[PDB]
Design a binder for this molecule. Structure first.
Ligand SMILES: CC(C)[C@H](C)[C@@H](O)[C@H](O)[C@@H](C)[C@H]1CC[C@H]2[C@@H]3COC(=O)[C@H]4C[C@H](O)[C@H](O)C[C@]4(C)[C@H]3CC[C@]12C
Length: 1217
């Protein structure tokens, strides 16, 4: 939407952060203008190094002096790279840790009705969690990289032009010839990747329907031809992935062919400007190098502007809640405070609707009255706003038309520390904050004593169960060490509402846990506190309502009838039907936040975002998302396994490993030709400096064509090898997902949106683990290897001191590559315990608003942000100092090589152009050896988070769909029998609805297992075919054990009809032929005319063909059911399995099954399940299931001849319309 300016992000800065930024921006400039000053000190050295070739005593003076200037330079990079990291990492924290402390003083004071779950309480939690890490990343340390590399651009054009100005206008005019083709590569490379994401979305729904509809894919045995349609929609992404590698070889070959055809330019006119008597070799070495690293260093300053715009986007979403003004606030001076309350709450002509949406009407002309010291029961028959009255006495909402008065005093003239203090609240699923179980009791009263805490939990059935825990009333209720994790939480929350002693006592519908004898223990606990209190009882079910002494019932906007439970039960006026209605009878945020986290982290790395889960039943768990270090490593023998899978392509690596050694030879060849022209620049024969600088230019032309035909080989090959590996893995993963049991798909983190992404991204970076980490190892170990053979043949007494100095040159060139991406490191991990305290004080705000606990959540927040600051005080003084010390050894150890270089020449041993060739080669080599030691952990350390796709390859399924040691099935006659069998759902193993079930179904008959009010009715058809396994006992079919038979040989003559039918993304000719392999045209027309939709299939535009899955014509719920019954009649099964539940038919003028009851049940053994007692006339037998057993069985002529049984209770439900 909108955005702030870049300033006003620096508006929480106190009078101490205007001092850490003044110092911290003199560190960023003096460290900036010290690489173009290095090119002036090293430039003036060579003037004295080789000018003085005839006087070997002036050499020792003018190199011993300029070597001392490197140590004086290294001590100004020592104390100025320390002052841009120890003053921007720490002063970017004290400004953002005062943004968190005022954003939470804003969302504790807004009106409580601002949060009604409508992507609102799932948005304030996300804004405090991630949007305060984007304002931190924008102002903390990437401002130091914006000043650093900009000042090199402004001081690379001042050292350059002052030395020799006719060479700082050639070298500047080169850079738009390199950056032209250096960005045309980066344009066309994106122009093919976007043709790959579009070429994959054809197969992004084929591996999406085959998992979300897995019950149908296993029922009709067609889990093989979801692999002959997924394989051929990857072959059009492989072939598009080949010419996205050729456009990487011709995008790096035409950059070393413009770079190495441009050093020949600036080194030719240096050979002219010296022959005219204008410059020398130390004023043409300064002008060229200072104006290129000055010109190349704008590509790093403008890399920070991507992060300075998210900090203006996320900066405005925070700064429109901090300065938002709410209505219902506390007036400490313009607000009264009474005494000796009585509690006669009265609603006097109040009308109200929700201010989120004023469409519906809730309390149109509403009038109820509350006595003093009595109980009422405000109850509706439906959602008539019966749960709204507790949200209005608390003044969570003002009544927009009406008045509410306490003892003849309107509540709009009282302060919100005296009104909310007198009312207690006990609600749905009572909120306990993840602290000790002693501090939760002290929310109802902050400080009285210890002995009243024990007396409060005494008369609440709580004094014992918090002593049967092996500590002194102290248990971390979030960290599930010793769990009071029953469905009956031992209700300490009722003990909160007793210690507070509220006069008005709002109770709520706190019987919503499938009540039993456990919920009757807390029932008398509520019955013993309700004395002398003006209390209400809001109830949803009238089972425990039997002793309430003045009940009032509302239906629509007002109360219908009042009185005690002698005259309310009388007269049958709108109460007898409601008690008849009694006789006829979170985890949403974490799924919502992860979808907001999905497709929003494509640029933010794994050190800044989170990954939201459900955790325990205390908090909302926030994983720091830097779990790639110490969570779920790969198998240790993976790198040999991923080479065994990728070995029919051996001739595409031998053509690439003898094509990646040839690119290691552009490392010495750049540094030998360039370090021979410093020699040539100091001749004194001006027609032998000419015909030797012609040879050193034709090599630059002849090595800008060697770099074209040695990157087309390195990157085209090793992309034939890298795309026949992310094609064989994706086919070996779908063929191993579609083999498991059905219960693995039932789990929440294995749904069909976290499993079609593991085939799109997590299996697409096996290319970047065994093909992009052998190319940059064979290259970098033949550039390290042939530049330590040149350096020893030329001169070996200097290149043995560099070899002892070489761990220090490769360390200083390694710390200059961590600094490009910040030294902060995993900044979402320290601010994780802090964020959950803001996370639990937003979603539990209806318990923070009562008890006046809006200052103790803030004092668990300012007392705890002290730890992630003193973590970021030691990390910013160590990382700032060790970076400022490793740079002292880069400049301070080139002073030792060059001084010892002038100790061997002056004693007659060496010469010039043998000390420089040893120096130039072994420093440019050390710049790319510290790239090999940067990808060195990620090979050993478990690969990475995408090299661990072996959980889907190596996972032994509980049910094996095919065997060799199992006899197949020839012909089923139908002998369905359940022996002594119990069963539980493996998703939630506490559900135990099956207890020793038994049936016996004879061939050529039917079965009519009734609904019985949803007592686990939809699991008999989930065991005739093995979608699950029983816990004990045998399932007998056709006289044989079912776990001894070939599963694919059995399912091709047992066909179900789905509860909720959905179709595949194809025509209506495949979706009616998917259930029969081989038949084409003859019996497909007539089987379409069985759930006769023939005018529906003749009246259709393109004959039979029409898209019905997606992006075509849309069908109704009554017409999609007609398609699924056309499948089963073409398959012609032996055991039919119908399923009807939760009134999902919805087909008025019912003729889709009036035809199908008598046509599809001719010789088929059917098992019908339906909750409706209509169109269920099983002509053979009928049964009733209760508690995992049958209670009554037989045909429908002896079940009705018996007087009651249990079927007569179901017979009442026909008149219960
Ligand atoms: C005086 C130098 C020899 C100095 C000691 C040396 O440390 C220097 O800082 C090195 C690391 C730099 C100076 C100039 C740089 C080059 C200047 O920019 C270029 O022309 C590019 C072209 C291309 O991008 C190459 O891959 C790197 C290459 C060719 C750069 C590679 C590294 C350098 C050669």
């Amino acid at each position: 939407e909108q955005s702030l300016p870049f300033f006003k992000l620096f508006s929480f800065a106190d009078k101490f952060d205007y001092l850490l930024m003044f110092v911290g921006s003199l560190g960023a400039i003096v460290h900036g203008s010290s690489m173009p000053v290095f090119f002036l000190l090293f430039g003036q050295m060579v003037n004295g190094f080789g000018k003085n070739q005839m006087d070997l005593h002036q050499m020792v003076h003018e190199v011993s002096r300029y070597s001392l200037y490197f140590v004086y330079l290294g001590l100004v990079v020592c104390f100025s790279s320390y002052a841009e990291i120890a003053c921007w990492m720490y002063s970017g924290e004290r400004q953002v840790a005062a943004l968190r402390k005022k954003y939470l003083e804003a969302v504790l004071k807004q009106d409580v009705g601002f949060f009604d779950t409508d992507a609102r309480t799932g948005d304030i939690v996300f804004s405090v969690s991630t949007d305060t890490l984007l304002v931190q990343d924008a102002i903390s340390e990437k401002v130091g990289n914006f000043i650093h590399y900009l000042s090199t651009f402004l001081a690379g054009l001042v050292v350059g032009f002052v030395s020799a100005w006719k060479l700082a206008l050639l070298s500047v005019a080169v850079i738009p010839g390199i950056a032209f083709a250096g960005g045309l590569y980066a344009y066309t490379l994106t122009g093919i990747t976007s043709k790959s994401r579009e070429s994959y979305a054809n197969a992004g729904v084929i591996a999406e329907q085959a998992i979300a509809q897995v019950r149908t894919v296993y029922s009709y045995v067609g889990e093989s031809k979801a692999l002959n349609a997924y394989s051929d929609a990857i072959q059009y992404t492989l072939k598009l992935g080949y010419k996205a590698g050729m456009a990487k070889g011709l995008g790096l070959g035409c950059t070393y062919g413009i770079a190495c055809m441009s050093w020949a330019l600036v080194f030719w006119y240096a050979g002219v400007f010296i022959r005219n008597g204008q410059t020398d070799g130390g004023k043409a070495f300064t002008a060229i190098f200072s104006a290129i690293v000055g010109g190349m260093s704008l590509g790093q300053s403008f890399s920070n502007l991507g992060a300075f715009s998210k900090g203006k986007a996320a900066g405005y979403k925070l700064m429109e809640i901090i300065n938002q003004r709410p209505t219902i606030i506390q007036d400490p001076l313009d607000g009264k405070c009474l005494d000796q309350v009585h509690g006669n709450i009265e609603f006097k002509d109040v009308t109200f609707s929700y201010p989120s949406r004023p469409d519906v009407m809730i309390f149109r002309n509403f009038n109820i009255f509350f006595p003093s010291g009595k109980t009422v029961a405000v109850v509706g028959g439906s959602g008539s706003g019966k749960s709204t009255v507790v949200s209005l006495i608390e003044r969570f909402y003002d009544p927009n038309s009406g008045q509410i008065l306490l003892d003849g005093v309107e509540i709009k003239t009282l302060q919100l520390k005296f009104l909310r203090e007198q009312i207690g609240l006990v609600n749905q699923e009572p909120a306990l904050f993840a602290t000790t179980i002693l501090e939760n009791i002290l929310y109802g009263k902050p400080d009285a004593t210890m002995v009243e805490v024990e007396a409060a939990a005494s008369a609440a059935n709580a004094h014992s169960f918090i002593t049967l825990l092996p500590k002194g009333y102290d248990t971390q209720v979030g960290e599930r060490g010793v769990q009071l994790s029953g469905g009956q939480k031992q209700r300490i929350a009722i003990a909160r509402a007793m210690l507070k002693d509220p006069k008005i006592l709002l109770l709520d519908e706190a019987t919503s846990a499938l009540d039993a004898s456990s919920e009757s223990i807390v029932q008398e606990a509520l019955d013993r506190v309700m004395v002398g209190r003006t209390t209400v009882v809001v109830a949803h079910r009238l089972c425990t309502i039997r002793n309430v002494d003045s009940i009032a019932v509302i239906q629509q906007g007002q109360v219908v009838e009042t009185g005690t439970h002698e005259e309310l039960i009388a007269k049958s006026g709108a109460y007898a039907s409601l008690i008849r209605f009694q006789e006829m009878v979170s985890t949403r945020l974490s799924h919502s936040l992860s979808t907001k986290s999905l497709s929003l982290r494509s640029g933010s790395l794994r050190n800044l975002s989170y990954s939201y889960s459900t955790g325990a039943d205390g908090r909302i768990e926030m994983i720091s998302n830097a779990e790639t270090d110490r969570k779920t490593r790969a198998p240790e023998n993976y790198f040999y396994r991923l080479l065994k899978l990728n070995s029919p392509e051996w001739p595409y690596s031998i053509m690439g490993a003898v094509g990646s050694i040839l690119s290691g030879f552009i490392g010495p060849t750049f540094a030998i030709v360039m370090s021979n022209m410093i020699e040539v620049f100091y001749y004194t024969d001006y027609d032998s400096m000419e015909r030797k600088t012609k040879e050193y230019v034709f090599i630059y032309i002849g090595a800008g064509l060697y770099a074209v035909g040695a990157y087309l080989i390195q990157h085209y090959f090793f992309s034939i090898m890298g795309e026949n590996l992310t094609t064989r893995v994706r086919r070996m993963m779908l063929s191993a997902i579609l083999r498991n049991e059905v219960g693995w798909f039932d789990e929440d983190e294995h749904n069909s949106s976290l499993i079609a992404a593991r085939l799109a991204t997590d299996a697409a970076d096996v290319k970047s683990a065994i093909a992009e980490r052998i190319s940059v190892i064979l290259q970098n170990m033949t550039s390290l290897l042939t530049s330590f053979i040149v350096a020893f043949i030329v001169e070996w007494r200097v290149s043995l001191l560099i070899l002892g100095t070489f761990p220090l040159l490769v360390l200083a060139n390694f710390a200059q590559q961590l600094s490009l991406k910040g030294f902060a490191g995993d900044t979402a991990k320290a601010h994780a315990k802090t964020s959950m305290i803001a996370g639990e004080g937003v979603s539990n705000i209806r318990t923070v608003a009562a008890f006046n606990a809006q200052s103790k959540i803030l004092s668990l927040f300012c007392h705890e942000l002290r730890v992630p600051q003193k973590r970021s005080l030691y990390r910013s003084q160590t990382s700032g100092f060790l970076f400022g010390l490793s740079q002292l050894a880069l400049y301070g150890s080139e002073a030792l090589i060059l001084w010892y270089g002038a100790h061997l020449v002056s004693k007659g041993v060496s010469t010039f152009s043998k000390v420089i060739k040893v120096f130039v080669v072994l420093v440019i080599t050390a710049n790319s050896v510290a790239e090999t030691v940067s990808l060195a952990p990620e090979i050993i350390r478990g690969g990475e988070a995408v090299g661990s796709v072996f959980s889907v390859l190596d996972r032994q399924t509980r049910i094996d769909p095919d065997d060799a040691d199992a006899d197949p099935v020839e012909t089923i006659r139908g002998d369905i029998e359940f022996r002594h069998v119990d069963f539980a759902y493996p998703s939630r193993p506490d559900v135990m609805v099956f207890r020793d079930f038994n049936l016996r179904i004879r061939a050529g008959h039917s079965q009519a297992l009734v609904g019985a009010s949803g007592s686990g009715k939809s699991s008999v058809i989930a065991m005739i075919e093995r979608f699950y396994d029983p816990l004990a006992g045998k399932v007998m079919i056709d006289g044989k054990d079912i776990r001894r038979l070939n599963l694919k040989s059995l399912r091709l003559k047992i066909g179900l009809v789905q509860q909720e039918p959905a179709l595949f993304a194809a025509t209506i000719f495949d979706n009616i032929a998917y259930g029969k392999d081989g038949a084409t045209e003859s019996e497909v027309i007539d089987a379409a005319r069985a759930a006769n939709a023939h005018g529906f299939i003749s009246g259709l535009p393109e004959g039979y063909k029409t898209p019905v899955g997606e992006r075509g014509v849309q069908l109704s719920g009554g017409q999609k059911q007609r398609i699924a019954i056309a499948r089963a009649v073409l398959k012609n099964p032996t055991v039919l399995l119908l399923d009807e539940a939760t009134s999902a038919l919805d087909a008025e003028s019912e003729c889709v099954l009036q035809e199908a009851l008598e046509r599809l049940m001719r010789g088929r053994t059917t098992v019908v399940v339906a909750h409706r007692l209509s169109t269920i006339r099983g002509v053979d037998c009928i049964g009733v299931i209760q508690d995992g057993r049958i209670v009554e069985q037989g045909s429908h002529s002896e079940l009705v001849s018996r007087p009651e049984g249990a079927y007569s209770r179901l017979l009442q439900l026909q008149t219960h319309r």
